[PDB]
Amino acid sequence: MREIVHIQGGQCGNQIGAKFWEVVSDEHGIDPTGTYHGDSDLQLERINVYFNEATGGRYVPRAILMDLEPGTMDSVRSGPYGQIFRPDNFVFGQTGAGNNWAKGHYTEGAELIDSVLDVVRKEAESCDCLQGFQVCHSLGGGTGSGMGTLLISKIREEYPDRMMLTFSVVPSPKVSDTVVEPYNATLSVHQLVENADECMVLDNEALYDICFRTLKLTTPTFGDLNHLISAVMSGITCCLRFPGQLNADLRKLAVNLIPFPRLHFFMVGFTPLTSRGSQQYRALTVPELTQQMWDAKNMMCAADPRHGRYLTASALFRGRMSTKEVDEQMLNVQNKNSSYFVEWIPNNVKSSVCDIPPKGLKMSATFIGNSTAIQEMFKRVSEQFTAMFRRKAFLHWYTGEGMDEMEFTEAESNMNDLVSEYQQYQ
Amino acid sequence: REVISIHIGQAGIQVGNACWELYCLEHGIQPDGQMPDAFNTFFSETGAGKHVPRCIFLDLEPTVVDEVRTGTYRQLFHPEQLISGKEDAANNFARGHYTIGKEIVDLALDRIRKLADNCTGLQGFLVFNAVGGGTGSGLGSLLLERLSVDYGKKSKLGFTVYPSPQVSTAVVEPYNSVLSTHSLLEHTDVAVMLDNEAIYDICRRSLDIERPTYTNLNRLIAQVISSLTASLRFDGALNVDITEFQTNLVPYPRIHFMLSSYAPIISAEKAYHEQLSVAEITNAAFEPASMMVKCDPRHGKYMACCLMYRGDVVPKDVNASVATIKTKRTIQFVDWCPTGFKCGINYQPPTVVPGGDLAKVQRAVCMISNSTAIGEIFSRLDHKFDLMYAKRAFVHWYVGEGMEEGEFSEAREDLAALEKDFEEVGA
Amino acid sequence: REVISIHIGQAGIQVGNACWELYCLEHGIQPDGQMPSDKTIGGGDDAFNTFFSETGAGKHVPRCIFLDLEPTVVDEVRTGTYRQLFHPEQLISGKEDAANNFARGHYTIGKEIVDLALDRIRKLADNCTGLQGFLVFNAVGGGTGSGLGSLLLERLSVDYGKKSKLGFTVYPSPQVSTAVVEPYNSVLSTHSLLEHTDVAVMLDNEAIYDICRRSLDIERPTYTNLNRLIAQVISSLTASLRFDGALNVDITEFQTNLVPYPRIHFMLSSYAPIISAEKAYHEQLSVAEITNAAFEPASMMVKCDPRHGKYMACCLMYRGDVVPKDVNASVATIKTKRTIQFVDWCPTGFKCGINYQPPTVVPGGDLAKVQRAVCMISNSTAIGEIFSRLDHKFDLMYAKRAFVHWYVGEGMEEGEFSEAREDLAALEKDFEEVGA
Amino acid sequence: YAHNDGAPDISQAFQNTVLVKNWYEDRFQSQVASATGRTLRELPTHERVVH
Amino acid sequence: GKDLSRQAAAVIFPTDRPAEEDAATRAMYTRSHQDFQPGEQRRRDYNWDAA
Ligand SMILES: Nc1nc2c(ncn2[C@@H]2O[C@H](COP(=O)(O)OP(=O)(O)OP(=O)(O)O)[C@@H](O)[C@H]2O)c(=O)[nH]1
């Protein structure tokens, strides 16, 4: 019916998407061999959104994997639910970028983007009515950021009417993996602010601290982080996949959360996240979900929302519940901490309800917050970018490839104008 | 994805003699060539049941070469992969660069040309040489020149053996080291320094091997090389390829010089003794008691770092350890680069060689960083070079071989330029 | 109607370890916390509600927080049989002990542990809806139960204040003692316990030892038996809230009916019949003998003599098969007797209470399930004699400045010593003034 | 800010038996791992991190 | 020979000797010397069957 085309770039994108197609296959109850094995017929009615029938109930995903190293493809085919992807959707170069936006945006794209454009085109016209695209990638790496943003720009030029979600992990100084993470981050976000519809900012700092303090795991490997991100993405798309008392599609979320075409950077939260040692302390009530949702320690971005103002927000509820308690709870949390919301928009909170909780769960909720405290993170990046660009550190591996320094000046300017307008609305 | 390695000189092929022993032991390849896909980046699988390495040994004296040809690894190495000249260059850059190079280098390059032809997904070249000698310096530089002419854009990882400040075996090694650096600047894309006094202090202090030979040095250097190619070879949680050192650690086209380090260098007894954790090995990889180059980074400022991890390593604790490093102030970074780290993790633990002195460790760290203490190295070498050049000593060897005063002068002022360079960037 | 219970110190949480065992047995709840599967609880389980808050389906978590600074005893609870009943988040544990040092327990470690205890007790009160009051458990002799306990009582009184705080403290015996500086720690405790708590009940140890020796015929009792019958006293006190009786009183009644003066709040407790299985068979149990039995010093919980004092007021909870006619007859016999004397301030010096449900004991043994029992909480002047006894032995050690260097090394000074000493003297003057 | 809130501990890690810092939660994980039969490390991410 | 035999360990900590069970003799000790184990009541010889 309404169709989502999933796109995954880079090492981060390939692994989080593997876990994403794992949990979605789980919710539609399809085995790792490709056949339905669920119980109720309620799951069969909305598998067109994510899978296509091939032969004998073989539901294969509508996904495009994209990278430059075969190691990502080996990690794809190694795990379970690694055999259900179509081998024609395993499009992949051979050389590798390796933390280089130039290589990811001018050379490797130049001969990889055409072939992925052929397959994503064949994938797009294979279905009838798109809802849009959903891309998960990174911003620190090269083959994710550069190749991803180039694809995003090119597919938005071809299909300007379809929606677009982008789950991008941003780097933090405390969890600082690469060295040229500012050069790739600034140039990517400068592409996103002009081309992407809306961006869900993620980072590993919040995810590690969440897994320490709220889950209390001793060894938080990547698979757990990927699953939490997967939980968020599944919670986002719950409404197209299942009926409810008040459905909300992605376009319905975009119009209720984007007041200005450049104010589309959200912070995200997911509930419930409790240590399985304390899973019996807590009950399952809407106020119990709300106190964990609006908490600052539960945002998936290293940005204190109490250091700014919520412009708008949206809450997606799953499971049988009572709408009265939902609305009065949102109203109460809006009136109590009244200073942390903006004044010239009343009723900043959009809510939605679908009637199917995720598997093994009884009632869940996903939080999308458009706050003005995201400029602290971009300032946290811009000051590093200024420190590098002052005397051109690491600059030649970019400039000697086809890029000029004017790209860096305009990316600097666009970022500074964005953080200024966020500060203005504060 | 493959990488071919070249070994130049008397040092180059002895390091290779220990390095390829490690590769056979890590991929379980018998010394006669057959196993009882991860190996495909080093051992091409000829015919049926036989792997034969992507390597070249070369030298001008046949002694150490046919010692390889008659060692344990007779059937393993291709008969002509090991190249051998007739007579030595004999601690003479000009002799190794103009007289004998002109007839050995052409056979070397039209040999690696068909090595590259058999290869498919070449990452690049990684070289092994010493600059104190003549064969490593002279035709090593001559080869690097013709490599840069032929391919150029392919990376050239250079693990070079500089002369130690105090401990020294030769006399003209200042001249040869200077003349080699003059070409090592604009030819190698990135270079790792390896002194011998630093490694001698390591084996004396940590390993407590009181009287070490070269083979102990070669063995743990091979351990370093294996720890930074483990990413290509095996699957890890976060693998970083060869083109990363190019990007994440070379801020300027003429600043590519890196101090290397390794931890834990621990014998068989201190292993059961010590509780190996990521915090202390990430700490121990920073004190100069564990640097492979005799210098003090206290006097310098770091520019970029890179950390390979092998074994049971989760990104949590490596992230916590580098956080404690960034918050410490005993070491310092330059202000013009805030994010001064790069990580990399591979799953397989480093294996041990029978009769070796290193123990089976759960996890290990190979740190490669850039600093300005290397600017201190070149100054300390240039000072004693001027000492000899003022009196024009030993010059008649080079001039009679074919060179003149110009190359001495221009290499002297080039090292002066590199000096001005490092002092300018460091502040 | 809900009441939350906090346990501070080594002694308090061991009493709670026995107390919650009794509660789950009274409401028939298995150690895991789920109800028995075979027996259906029914929709309106209001009785469990005062202590256990139903969460989700079939699980009851108590409204309690064990907290202490040494981790040993707390993690013994965490690894014992009641691992599943409390999950980790209420059992607050420090890193190192206060070590019998009121200063160390009130100023050194209290500064970082009390705030965590407070915003937890906030969330517990938020979960609650009809909060009747708090009740605390501590032994004033120790370091944690005295220091941080008083700090906790102070910040609770500045948080809520108006709600009643039933303090069940354990005083040091005159001759029986395990510590040395507990005179100092006790005096410094009462310095705050006088004006902070509302209704504070005293529990000695040697009196209980005499009880297990004489009536329970246990020749050598351990702490387990002490805490078991103390849990019986507490359960018999709150059974008026937990269960419907013919004549119910709530927790605010001791506030009005037992405390005639805002600073004179110290209550002697007693229980009857403390009886084994053999004596019960040989003894006919009725109300007149136990109403007597509740007044002899051989069945009190504090080693003092009510003969030398005069009663201020008395309160009698009856559990089991008790009709009002004969309890009225027995208290008539008491008020006409002359072996005990009341104050001329109150003619009507009694407060009765009847509940239908009989006492329940651990099935293993030590106590025969009886048809009826009584718990007496009175007010007299023998308590003033106890304080004077502790004040003398405090002054003896203070005159030579013994052990003072630990406190001043922690950061306290002679000012609070002298002012607490004169405060207790003021309490002695108040007792002697009201008793006349 | 909100997510820093702490200092990394310079301390060694014991097993789940010794009562050092996180033994309680780790003990529950290990218990359910023994109940199923597989080890603690080998577990589906959902089983380890969702309700 | 003597400090390798280490007789003092054996005399201070008699590991070779069986521990304190005295299953039935504890009853006769309680009967004769009135010395019970700590957490026990005094036990009369009541025929509870008759009642
Ligand atoms: N660490 C280490 N250094 C070595 C080894 N072999 C040779 N060297 C060093 O190489 C330096 C000089 O170069 P040589 O290897 O002796 O000879 P060369 O470089 O081939 O030059 P020619 O003698 O003309 O052939 C000496 O300072 C040695 O310390 C080795 O196996 N390990």
Ligand SMILES: Nc1nc2c(ncn2[C@@H]2O[C@H](COP(=O)(O)OP(=O)(O)OP(=O)(O)O)[C@@H](O)[C@H]2O)c(=O)[nH]1
């Ligand atoms: N009734 C009863 N009293 C106890 C018990 N355990 C300890 N006490 C009393 O507590 C007094 C000392 O205080 P403790 O509770 O033991 O220790 P504390 O209050 O935690 O102070 P610190 O040891 O410094 O932490 C002793 O004199 C005992 O009389 C018990 O299990 N039951």
Ligand SMILES: Nc1nc2c(ncn2[C@@H]2O[C@H](COP(=O)(O)OP(=O)(O)O)[C@@H](O)[C@H]2O)c(=O)[nH]1
């Ligand atoms: N949460 C999460 N982050 C990842 C994962 N894999 C990589 N990353 C992050 O991605 C960043 C580096 O991206 P990179 O792999 O270089 O992107 P690419 O080279 O373009 O494919 C690092 O900061 C990692 O923290 C994963 O599985 N989960």
Ligand SMILES: [Mg+2]
């Ligand atoms: Mg030589």
Ligand SMILES: [Mg+2]
């Ligand atoms: Mg104590």
